[PDB]
Ligand binder design. Sequence first.
Ligand SMILES: [Ca+2]
Ligand SMILES: [Ca+2]
Lengths: 139, 65
Amino acid sequence: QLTEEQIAEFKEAFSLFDKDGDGTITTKELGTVMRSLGQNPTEAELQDMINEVDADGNGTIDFPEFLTMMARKMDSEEEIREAFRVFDKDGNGYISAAELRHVMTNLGEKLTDEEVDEMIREADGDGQVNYEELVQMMT
Amino acid sequence: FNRQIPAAASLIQTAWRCYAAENPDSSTWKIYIRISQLREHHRATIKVIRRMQYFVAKKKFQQAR
Ligand SMILES: [Ca+2]
Ligand SMILES: [Ca+2]
């Protein structure tokens, strides 16, 4: 939709990453921000994040590349809906709130119980989480 | 043994964390232990980082398949 205010907001967000001002985000600058927030990423994680945005293979991220990344939306609903199917055992379209909490807090990124609570509490009535509702909320 | 169980979990986690961050009062903001107070400059860079991690978890899920 070619938003205008978003550019002013994005340029500010790009400035917090580009300490140089050379118009370029590098993995070192990406790790500097993540480490400032208490995160401990690896070089594989940092370059995976930059490879995902580095559209021209520069190895770095300029502002227009950042802007394209931020302008993306969410298609991608089929991939997310397919991700839940890995944990839908009965195939009915439901994951147990006990199962979801167990899989989400123990695997991958590891959500917190209160984070999973917001998932289950958006879900419906008895502990049967409808993941199709979740795919819809995020899209 | 089924390399999608971790990849599918991370795609859901990163997609939800990216979606829950638009709510400034979500419980997803309470995970940044090392920050005494979450100022506005933290939330700007956190939104960006969570968007990148979703894109990585998006690609890693398609790669395992
Ligand atoms: Ca720089
Ligand atoms: Ca580049």
